[PDB]
Amino acid sequence: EKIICRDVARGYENVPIPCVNGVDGEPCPEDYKYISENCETSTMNIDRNITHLQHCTCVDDCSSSNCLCGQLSIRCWYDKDGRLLQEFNKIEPPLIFECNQACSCWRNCKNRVVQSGIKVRLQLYRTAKMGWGVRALQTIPQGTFICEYVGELISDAEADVREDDSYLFDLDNKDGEVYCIDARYYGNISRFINHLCDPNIIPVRVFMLHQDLRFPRIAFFSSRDIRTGEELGFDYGDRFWDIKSKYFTCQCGSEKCKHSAEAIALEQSRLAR
Amino acid sequence: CRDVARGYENVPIPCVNGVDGEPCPEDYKYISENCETSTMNIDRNITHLQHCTCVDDCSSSNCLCGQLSIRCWYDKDGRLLQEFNKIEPPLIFECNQACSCWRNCKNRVVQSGIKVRLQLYRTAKMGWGVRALQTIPQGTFICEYVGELISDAEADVREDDSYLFDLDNKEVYCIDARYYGNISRFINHLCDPNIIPVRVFMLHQDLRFPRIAFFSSRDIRTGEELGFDYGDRFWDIKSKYFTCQCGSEKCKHSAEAIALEQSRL
Ligand SMILES: CCCC[C@H](NC(=O)c1[nH]c2c(c1C)C(=O)CC(C)(C)C2)C(=O)NCc1ccc(CN(C)C)cc1
Ligand SMILES: CCCC[C@H](NC(=O)c1[nH]c2c(c1C)C(=O)CC(C)(C)C2)C(=O)NCc1ccc(CN(C)C)cc1
Ligand SMILES: Nc1ncnc2c1ncn2[C@@H]1O[C@H](C[C@@H](N)CC[C@H](N)C(=O)O)[C@@H](O)[C@H]1O
Ligand SMILES: Nc1ncnc2c1ncn2[C@@H]1O[C@H](C[C@@H](N)CC[C@H](N)C(=O)O)[C@@H](O)[C@H]1O
Ligand SMILES: [Zn+2]
Ligand SMILES: [Zn+2]
Ligand SMILES: [Zn+2]
Ligand SMILES: [Zn+2]
Ligand SMILES: [Zn+2]
Ligand SMILES: [Zn+2]
Ligand SMILES: [Zn+2]
Ligand SMILES: [Zn+2]
Secondary structure, eight states: OEEEESOTTTTOSSSOOOEEESSSSOOSOOSSEEOSSOEESSOOOOOOOGGGOOOOOOSSOSOSTTOHHHHTTSSOOBOTTSOBOTTOOSSSOOOEEOOOTTSSSOTTSSSOSGGGOOOSOEEEEEOSSSSEEEEESSOBOTTOEEEEEOEEEEOHHHHHHOSOOTTEEESOSSSSOOOEEEEEEEEOGGGGOEEOSSOSEEEEEEESSOOOTTOOEEEEEESSOBOTTOBOEEOOOHHHHHHHTTTOOOOOOOTTOSSSHHHHHHHHHHHOO | OOOTTTTOSSSOOOEEOSSSSOOSOOSSEEOSSOEESSOOOOOOBGGGOOOOOOOSOSOSTTOHHHHHTSSOOBOTTSOBOTTSOSSSOOEEEOOOTTSSSOTTSSSOTGGGOOOSOEEEEEOSSSSEEEEESSOBOTTOEEEEEOEEEEEHHHHHHOSOOTTEEEOOOOOOEEEEEEEEEOGGGGOEEOSSOSEEEEEEESSOOOTTSOEEEEEESSOBOTTOBOEEOOOHHHHHHHTTTOOOOOOOTTOSSSHHHHHHHHHHO
16 A cells, blocks of 8 residues: 555645555556636636625624525525534535625635635545545544535536546536536546445535526535545436446445445346346 | 725735825725626636646746746746846746646746735825835735726726726727726826736636736835836826826926926927
């Protein structure tokens, strides 16, 4: 086992993200460009108009019920330490509207967690069965911001012709025109987070410096206390596995695994009779 | 006010008034980065970024971004080299998200933000101004001219040009700090200036949209008012409404200076 890179983010995050390999001879991944914030190749025509921001008139730290930005998700879901409240809906999370440059409040108000970046210590590591993965190097309480799903913002039409969908994330569940983040060519640490059938982080859609609802940003928060050494993972979703399961099956090893060869076979044999 | 920037800069920018009873200004919105109010089609395509292949601190002459800048003009402490053309500054291309270097390389001064202590204050004759609260060595990055990116056509429609900065394209775009701006909107004209504007590219390289960075052109002492040369064009427009009050012996735009040149004719 060897530390093969001290910081895959090259200093772009608040904290380093080392890479270790104790499984094989694979060097730290080079077949992508690490970026800390979303990029575009062809333009997405994002509405950046500062006058199109809903914003608040608070002169405190935006902890009162009078903060419009909080009201845009019924309430601000962050406590004084930046963690999601206990009663936050982790099954169907609301859209979060953080404070922004139009708000009268200060940059250090309580409604600005995701825009402040990575704070926890993570490690890129070689897994036994799933390629690279990401694990915690510290205790992470439930409700803590982990990292953003960062990559190249692309259209539905462009996503459809991309050869590799292994790093592709669509931004809404609906049937219409849905934009995507493709982390294949450009991405951050999130591109390495694997699927777990017993996940410990959840994606939350967030708005910060724009409120172009076509382009929510994807923030991962812990859904339970996470222990040092624990692999991070979220539920990729059934749609992902419907596509992929003819190529590989889930190796998460959970007793609750929904997408292993065994689980899939038990499903099909249920119908084979 | 302890900080007109509301915590958005690396350091506070306090405001004081020891001249009259005017409250610190509130007839604008402080923003720390440029904004837009109608679509500005800036080319942000990451594949269009020229970028370097350095793994050093980008002080090497092999750094492409340095070469794009003619050379990297930053010394080890982030200050412009003496050889920098302060009369007609070049374009600076800082490193960006496409470069292979680390975020702490030597070619990222402007994108790292304000480091010096400044103060918004009431001047005797020129309204509000900005002054240093520390010694500032020559070549030091001070602040960016931040405001609302607008087209020249939009600029022509607007009533007030007192906070309008022409990016000098030859289609034309401007930064209007009238409604949205940062501390730079308060920096006055001086005929004996101590800072200079420099065109800089950082996260995009759309040459239609340079960002404007101010650097000190000489050592500045604590308490000294900051100022740059607004340019003859500004004064050709404005001299019919007011004249220069900078009070320098080399003042070019005072009523007296103007009258002398006119009577000469
Ligand atoms: C590799 C990233 C995880 C796996 C990933 N998951 C999600 O996109 C997703 N979207 C939402 C979630 C997740 C997990 C949520 O949980 C909720 C959400 C509202 C954020 C909406 C996926 O399924 N990738 C295949 C793929 C994506 C997109 C296309 C392009 N078009 C055909 C749609 C093709 C293939
Ligand atoms: C209040 C800001 C200082 C004064 C200001 N100075 C500059 O714009 C300027 N531009 C460059 C400089 C300066 C000082 C430089 O030094 C060099 C540069 C290449 C950065 C190009 C000005 O002249 N404002 C009147 C004004 C601007 C724009 C319009 C709209 N269109 C007719 C263009 C009308 C009136
Ligand atoms: N639960 C899983 N079981 C098997 N393979 C997985 C699982 N989760 C992620 N993967 C693999 O990881 C890919 C998704 C990537 N976004 C994650 C990083 C990937 N492990 C890598 O090494 O680059 C999938 O297409 C699979 O190849
Ligand atoms: N040298 C000067 N002489 C007279 N007035 C000046 C001078 N420099 C700047 N000004 C004034 O300041 C305006 C430019 C502003 N960007 C500077 C801040 C301005 N002093 C204010 O109080 O808002 C000009 O239109 C003038 O009203
Ligand atoms: Zn608020
Ligand atoms: Zn706020
Ligand atoms: Zn707000
Ligand atoms: Zn599983
Ligand atoms: Zn370089
Ligand atoms: Zn560099
Ligand atoms: Zn570079
Ligand atoms: Zn003068």
